[PDB]
Every structure is written in C-alpha cells, then in structure tokens.
Design a protein around this nucleic acid. Sequence first.
RNA 1: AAACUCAGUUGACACAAAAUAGACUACGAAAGUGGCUUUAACAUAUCUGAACACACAAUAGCUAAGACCCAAACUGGGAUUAGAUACCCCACUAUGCUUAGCCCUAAACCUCAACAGUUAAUCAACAAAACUGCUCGCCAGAACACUACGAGCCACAGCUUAAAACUCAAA
Lengths: 128, 300, 137, 85
Amino acid sequence: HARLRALNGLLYKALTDLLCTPEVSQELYDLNVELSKVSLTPDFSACRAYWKTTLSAEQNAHMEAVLQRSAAHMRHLLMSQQTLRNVPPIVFVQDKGNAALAELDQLLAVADFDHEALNKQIMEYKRR
Amino acid sequence: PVMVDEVVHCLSPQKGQIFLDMTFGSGGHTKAILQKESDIVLYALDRDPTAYALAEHLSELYPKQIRAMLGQFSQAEALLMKAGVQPGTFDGVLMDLGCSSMQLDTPERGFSLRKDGPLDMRMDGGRYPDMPTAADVVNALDQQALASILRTYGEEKHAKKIASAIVQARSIYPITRTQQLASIVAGAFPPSAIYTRKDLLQRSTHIATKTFQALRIFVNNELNELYTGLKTAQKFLRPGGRLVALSFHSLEDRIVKRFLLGIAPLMWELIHKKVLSPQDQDVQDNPRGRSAKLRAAIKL
Amino acid sequence: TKFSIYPPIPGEESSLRWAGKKFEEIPIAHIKASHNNTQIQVVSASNEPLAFASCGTEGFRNAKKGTGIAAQTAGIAAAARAKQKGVIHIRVVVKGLGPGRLSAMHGLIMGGLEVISITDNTPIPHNGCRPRKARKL
Amino acid sequence: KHLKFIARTVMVQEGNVESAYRTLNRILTMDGLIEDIKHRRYYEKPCRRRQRESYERCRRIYNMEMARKINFLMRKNRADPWQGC
RNA sequence: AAACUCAGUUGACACAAAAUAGACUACGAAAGUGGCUUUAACAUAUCUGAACACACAAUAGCUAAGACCCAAACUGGGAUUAGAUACCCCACUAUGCUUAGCCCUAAACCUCAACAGUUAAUCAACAAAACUGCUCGCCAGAACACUACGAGCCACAGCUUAAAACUCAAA
Ligand SMILES: Nc1ncnc2c1ncn2[C@@H]1O[C@H](CSCC[C@H](N)C(=O)O)[C@@H](O)[C@H]1O
Ligand SMILES: [K+]
Ligand SMILES: [Mg+2]
Ligand SMILES: [Mg+2]
Ligand SMILES: [Mg+2]
Ligand SMILES: [Mg+2]
Ligand SMILES: [Mg+2]
Ligand SMILES: [Mg+2]
Ligand SMILES: [Mg+2]
Ligand SMILES: [Mg+2]
Ligand SMILES: [Mg+2]
Ligand SMILES: [Mg+2]
C-alpha cells in the first residue's frame, strides 16, 4: 500500500538520522548501528527496524541489547520531533541476510567450474 | 454524438488522411467526420449486424469514402488484414465504448430495463446465435460466480445479496425478461431502495442499473476485448496518428488510462493532459452521455 | 604542552602552523547539508571562491541527491577542484543535519585535502520565523 | 555578527577527523543544540510542548527515584549468610 | 511532479518571533505572563457577598488604517484518483502582528466555590486522604434542549437567560 511504503521510508530516514547522533545515548552512538530497512505492520501495531549485525556474536548481542533498551526512548524522540503523530512501538530486528551473501562470496572465490472459467458453466447450462 | 465537437477538433480531419472507427453504432461521429472532410478515407467497424447494415446503407451517401465492416475487436485485426492494410497507416482511430443509443432505445435488444424485453443484452444481433444471452448468464452462473461478476463489473458493494436473489428467482422460475430481472434485483432490497441510489448527477436511478451494466459487460466481454482493440489500434495506427477514446464507466476509463500510461518509455503523447468532459448543458441535453470521458493521444 | 580542541585565537601568538600558514589564513570549506541535498563550496581566507560542488552538479537527480554516496562524490569533486587550485589544508564549517553531513566530509578527505578544524554553523533561530506545521499522514 | 571559527569549533588532533567530528557531535548533543535543531523543523503547538515537558520532567523524576531505590537495595544482594535458616 | 533560475560564501538589513537558562514553579483575580532597559505598578489584614451592577476575560471572528519575515484556513496548481475531495509538494489570501473599537465564547479544568478549623475516632467506588463550621451560587430521571418563544446585548448564520407538548423505564 502506498501510504505504508511512504511511512516506511519516512521512518527509515528518521531513524537513520537519529542513530547518526549521540542524541539517544552515547553508547548507542558509539555502537554505530546501521539499518537495512524499516517495515510497518499492516494494522500499524508495530514498526520493525531491521538492523545489520556484525560478524562478532558478542558485539551483536550487545548492540541488540542496547537497541532493545533504547527503543522506547527512540519512539519518544520520534514523537517529539513530530515526524509522525502516532508512532507504534519500535522493534529492532537483527538482519543476517548480508552474512549469507558474504559467505557465498567467500566460498565462490574457491568454487571450481475469469470469463473463460465461467464460460464453461454457461456452455454446460446451454447444452443441458 | 457525445462531444462531437471535441472529437472533430482533436482528430482534425484532413484531405487524404486515413481514419478508423472501431465502433460504428449509430455512426453519428463517423457522419460528422465525413461531413467536415469530404476527401477523408474512413473505415467503420461494428459488432451489431444492424449497425453494419446501417453503415452499408449510409455508404450510398459516400460510396468509397466510408467502408463498413462487421466484427469484434478481436476480429478487427483479421478483418482489416483481409481488407489489405497490415501496417494500417491510419491517420486516426476513434474508439467509442458503452452501449449504442439505437441498441439501448430498442426494447427488443434487451439493453433497457425501463422497457420490457428478452434478457438478451447482447451487442451481437444474430451474427453468433450460439453466443450466450444475459438470461443464460444469470440462469447458469452460480452464487459465487455471479457475485464476483457483479462486484468486478458493476462495482456493486452488495453483490452477494443481488446474486442470491437472482439465484432464488431463477430457481423458482426462469428469468427471461428485463423487467423480471429488474423486479428481482429490487426485491433483494427494501422497496424504498428502488430509486435510493443516485448517480453522479444526483438524480434517482434504478438499483438494477449496476446489475445490468455488469451483465452486459460479462456477456460482451467488454474489458478484455477493449484491451485487445486498443492493442490492435496501436499496432495499426500510423506513427503520429491520433487516437480518441470515449468512455462511459470507471473500468474502461481505468483500462484506457493504464494502457496509455503503460502502468518502459511511453508509447503515447497525451494531446490533452486532463480528461475532457462534455459541457454541463450538453450533459443535461444528453444524460446518457454524462459519464462520457474523452482521452486523446498521439502514437509514439 | 598538549593538544587543545579550542581553535587558536585570532590576533594571538599561536605557534601552530599549517604549511607555514596561520589558522586565520587556512581556506574554508562550507558544507550545507539540506534534508535532500549537499552543497559544498571552498573559499579562501578572504572569501574568494575556489571550488564548488553539489549532488545536482555531480549528476545525481531527485532522491539520489539526498544520499551519502552523492555527498561523498560531491566532496571528492570539490576536493579535486580545490587541489587543482593549490588547496591542501582546509577548515570545514558545516550547516544543517542532512544525511551527507559526515559523508561529504569523507569525500572531501578522499580528495587529498586535510581537514584541520571541524566547525558547526547550523542556523539555529533562538526564536524567529515560525516553522511549518507538522506533517500529518 | 559574531566572530567566526570560535563557536562550535573543534580542532582535529593528529588528523583523526572522524574522532573530531564525533566529539563535536557529542558537544552539540550535550548542549541540546541537536534537540532544538530537530524540534524546530516543525512547529510544536504550545499545549503539546507543555505536555511533552511535563512528561519529560515526570519521567526524569521517576527514573531518578527508581535508580536511587535500586542502588539502595543493591546492598542486600550479597550472598546469603544464613543458608539453611 | 509541478515552479525558481537561481543557489552558495561574505556584507548590509524588521513594526515578526522571543534558543540555552527553565531539571526553575514564580507573578496575576482569572484569562494569562519566560529577550533587554527605564518609568509607573502589583486593592483590603478582620470573612462571605451578583440574572442584581461595575470591570476584565485565551484562541477564533467582525470594523477601519497600517506593517510583510514566516506561518496559514480559503483558493490556485502539482501529483494521486475512473474522476473529485482529503493526506503529500509548491505558490498565495483572510488571519496570527501594531493602532482604535467591537465580539464575550473554551476540556475558560486542580473538572474539587470562598473563608475558618481539625487529624480525632478513615472511607461506596475512582479521582487529589477524611471531615467539621459558615456563607454565596447551583441541582431535583433521561431525552426534547449549548432548542423554541420572550427579553437584553455595538452582538444580525451571534451570545446570555431558558421552556413546553409528544415519548421512554430507564438514562
Ligand atoms: N468490441 C466491439 N467490437 C465492435 N463493435 C463493438 C464492440 N463493442 C461495442 N461495439 C459496437 O459499438 C457501439 C458501442 S457504443 C455506440 C457508439 C457509436 N459510435 C454510436 O454513436 O453509435 C455499439 O453499436 C456496439 O454494437
Ligand atoms: K529568547
Ligand atoms: Mg468580597
Ligand atoms: Mg461573579
Ligand atoms: Mg476576548
Ligand atoms: Mg484579532
Ligand atoms: Mg509562506
Ligand atoms: Mg487554561
Ligand atoms: Mg464565591
Ligand atoms: Mg456555546
Ligand atoms: Mg441560542
Ligand atoms: Mg429569540
């Protein structure tokens, strides 16, 4: 739906601007979190921000924990900036899609080489 | 001819130019075009054999300047290939949609619910006897099929109710008359709801008008055949030729708009950016042509 | 001694030099990072324009202008033009909070020019013209 | 009308331009300039501003009280000295 | 997309608006009042006291004359729509400002009347713990009804006061 797409783009831009600043918290800015996309629920119940995860598992867990802690504060900041009148709760979802592409790149470097349907009923009724 | 002045001005008939009229019908637009330009070459195609005979008779006025042809949009390409113009090179194409004034005024054709007629509602006038009639359509299609057809073609919100009423009525007695079907459609709603629905003109209209429109479209397959006709007109039209399409309902207008806008580089140049509409006084004079929207383009 | 983030005071006996020049002599690089664009202009110490670049000038159009890559490309182009005019060290002053606010700088660094001081001059009306009403969607 | 390159100016240290930019951004955040810049993009109506300020004050007070309570009760979190009783 | 051929650095430049302080909780009868200076100035120590007068009363609005940054109903485009409106983008007006009058409405809400007193044996519930003394105003099922009529008003699609008949066993 067009409105959902526009809202997704606006929220993605706003969140990207938010995370490029120490505004939310110094630790979150130091984490230098990136986003791949932002998707809204069809019923506007929640806003899922898909953040890219690094290779380090412990660093990934730390970043996810900080994002979960600061999601409510970021929602309040978005509502304060009036980027959206009613902002649904923000859920930070890990994105491991790029890891699969990276591993494929690593391994490939060593890989070797309507009307007609009812017309039947109409025909049958005419014949019958 | 609805918006005859606009069509004449936009097409700009000129000497030695080739023009096609994919829907002759009454031929009022064709007659006006031949009136303005006495040296124009015109081919007029229609589905109604009555309209084909009318065009043949009117060919007495213009022996060779107008050439009549009988067939659908799908048959249009084959018939024009038989004529001998595969490139076409037509300097213009005119596509008037909807139901003919002669077809609707005649109760025998069954297009009018106001005057009782057989539930034919078939633009074909005996060329294809095996073609199903509206009575066959209503007596054949199931509840879900009829509801889907009504919802998609007549834009009827209450397609389920009308379909169920029609199914019950056909189960009781066969449905063969236009007034019978109109009474069945009215019975699905309270009697006060016979004229509750008001058109965009804010005048009371029969509640069975949408059902009749949907049934006519499904009988004649107007959407897909209009798509094929537009494609054939694009294929046959001369480069720089002028295509003028007249619509009477939202579905065909949407189809024409999407085809013109390609919804890839555009293959049309809109002569008029916004859709042209008849004068309000002209709308009052011709209530039937109120919903006639004009879309004009040049082949690119 | 030790490093000081505070810029050296004009008209003061500051021993710091850059290519033999004083801080008041180092050319300036203005970066206006608007919400959908990034315009970069290099001027001398005497406000003499030397290089100008922007996402539109680089060929990016519409939303492509409001991207960090476009800002980096504009920075690289402006840095190349300034280097062709003899610019090495620059004081960067940036206004606005556009997406390219940092990215342009990176491009301006990739062109070979050295940034000696990062300055913010974002227009902040203490309270001036009333801003537009909040968008509703 | 003020002198240039004094306000919101950070000198880069040995070329760590990224670090200098992060320091300047932290300074702007601490001084609240970023908040003002982003909140002045659109006009916040006075009633909305008052509601937001009251909510922020209440949230800050509640967070401080909760943190103080947690810190005060953290002393009890030692190992159990009376295990089995 | 439309439209501007303007955009950027620097300089000059308001009758508009009043970052941070303000995480303060002050002033005023309330409405309200958060840039700076100066002048004038914040009633009554004995309480209460207006359909019964005097004087106020945010925003919106009217009348007249100005001011033009920005904002902005309305309108005109741009997209979008089958088409049209709304939302989004652009331009722009009444209007927000000043002067001089009007209008006298707000969820004008701490939704908890003014004054005095008590913390003793708690209190339907929820809200802001429970009461006492005293005074003024107001209420007596819902709906009809921020209505009709009458009257008053600088008000003329207005405000204030404010019913009845029919109907319901609820609200
Ligand atoms: N797919 C199709 N192919 C050929 N003729 C068609 C057609 N669909 C409709 N027609 C015919 O074209 C007309 C459509 S409406 C009538 C318009 C006509 N120009 C007039 O003024 O009379 C009808 O006469 C109908 O019979
Ligand atoms: K101020
Ligand atoms: Mg008194
Ligand atoms: Mg009083
Ligand atoms: Mg007032
Ligand atoms: Mg006023
Ligand atoms: Mg404006
Ligand atoms: Mg108030
Ligand atoms: Mg009182
Ligand atoms: Mg009222
Ligand atoms: Mg009244
Ligand atoms: Mg009266």
